[PDB]
Design a protein around this ligand. Structure first.
Ligand SMILES: O=c1[nH]c(-c2ccc(Cl)c(S(=O)(=O)NC3CCCC3)c2)cs1
Length: 125
């Protein structure tokens, strides 16, 4: 298929964890970003069949999206906040890689990244 399987949202041989920071990343960071007017392209894995982008997964080898991140947080999939933050950063970076400076989609990612950084600047202790 043109679409690989989406990233795992559970893994039984990976240990789980819950922390105040991870709770915050779900309740505040993810759930607030989700509502932004520019969040929609990032709420699910890129569907190359739907969007007609047979090139997407030829270019992006570590795909990530907020739908996956949300499910991971709900699963307690992550060990710590930094691991989750890395997924957000991978999502943003993928967008910059797959596209071009100034593209509408890149403008969207740039705005979301700024808001994301604002919110993770300070996490609970
Ligand atoms: O690098 C990424 N692009 C996208 C994405 C998702 C949906 C849509 Cl419509 C778009 S887009 O920038 O408006 N390009 C559309 C024009 C043809 C394919 C989709 C990008 C999510 S991550």
């Amino acid at each position: 298929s043109m679409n690989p399987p989406p990233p795992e949202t559970s893994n039984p041989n990976k240990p789980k964890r819950q922390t105040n920071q991870l709770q915050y990343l779900l309740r505040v960071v993810l759930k607030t970003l989700w509502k932004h007017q520019f969040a929609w392209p990032f709420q699910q894995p890129v569907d190359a069949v739907k969007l007609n982008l047979p090139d997407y997964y030829k270019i992006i080898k570590t795909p990530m999206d907020m739908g996956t991140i949300k499910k991971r947080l709900e699963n307690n999939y992550y060990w710590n906040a930094q691991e989750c933050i890395q997924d957000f950063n991978t999502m943003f970076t993928n967008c910059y890689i797959y596209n071009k400076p100034g593209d509408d989609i890149v403008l969207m990612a740039e705005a979301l990244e700024k808001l994301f950084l604002q919110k993770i600047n300070e996490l609970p202790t």
